[PDB]
Amino acid sequence: VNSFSGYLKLTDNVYIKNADIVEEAKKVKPTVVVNAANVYLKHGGGVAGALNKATNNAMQVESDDYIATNGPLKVGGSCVLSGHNLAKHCLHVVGPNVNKGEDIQLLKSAYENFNQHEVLLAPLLSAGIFGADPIHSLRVCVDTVRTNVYLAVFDKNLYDKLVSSFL
Numbered sequence: 001v002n003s004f005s006g007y008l009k010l011t012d013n014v015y016i017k018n019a020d021i022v023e024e025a026k027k028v029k030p031t032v033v034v035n036a037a038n039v040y041l042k043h044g045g046g047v048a049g050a051l052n053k054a055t056n057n058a059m060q061v062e063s064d065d066y067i068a069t070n071g072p073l074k075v076g077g078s079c080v081l082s083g084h085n086l087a088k089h090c091l092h093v094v095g096p097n098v099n100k101g102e103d104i105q106l107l108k109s110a111y112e113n114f115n116q117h118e119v120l121l122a123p124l125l126s127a128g129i130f131g132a133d134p135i136h137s138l139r140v141c142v143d144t145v146r147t148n149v150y151l152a153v154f155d156k157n158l159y160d161k162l163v164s165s166f167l
């Protein structure tokens with residue numbers, strides 16, 4: 001039993017809810033919140049910008065030190081940093097950005113990072129300003145992630161479409 005509330009069960013291990021991932025993280029305080037990161041950990045907009053804003057820019061300060069030490073992530077890769085006031089840990093995962101021409105096959109590799117964590121609160125990777133089809137992203141998620149994932153979908157219209165078209 002865990003504290004995630006009001007989710008629709010899609011599969012044995014994947015759950016979804018129309019929710020603001022920032023508000024959901026503040027209420028649940030999960031072990032892991034996933035950020036929709038880029039390779040530079042520049043959290044300017046979309047989910048990343050929102051999570052970083054909710055940390056009063058502490059996420060960005062920590063991220064800049066991480067990059068200064070380690071260099072950029074790989075598309076499809078991840079790193080674990082602090083969750084600040086939102087979660088114990090933040091798993092920064094880089095899905096491909098279609099608006100940069102990145103290979104959509106890297107989406108499966110990106111979701112594989114979730115399997116290193118037993119339970120996660122996460123957005124749909126490569127959705128939103130990353131330019132991929134969220135229906136496709138949900139399908140890859142369900143077919144790749146084996147650990148327990150609670151997906152927060154900000155847009156109600158998209159949530160309903162994600163739900164009604166789900167196979």
Ligand SMILES: CNC(=O)Nc1ccc(C(=O)N[C@@H]2c3cccc(O)c3C[C@@H]2C(=O)O)cc1
Nearest residue numbers: 021022046047050123124127128134153154155
């Ligand atoms: C104060 N709180 C706050 O600003 N929160 C916040 C801000 C932005 C996002 C975001 O960009 N979401 C994206 C989006 C939008 C439309 C269609 C979409 O396919 C997606 C994918 C993303 C998602 O829904 O996971 C999420 C939360």
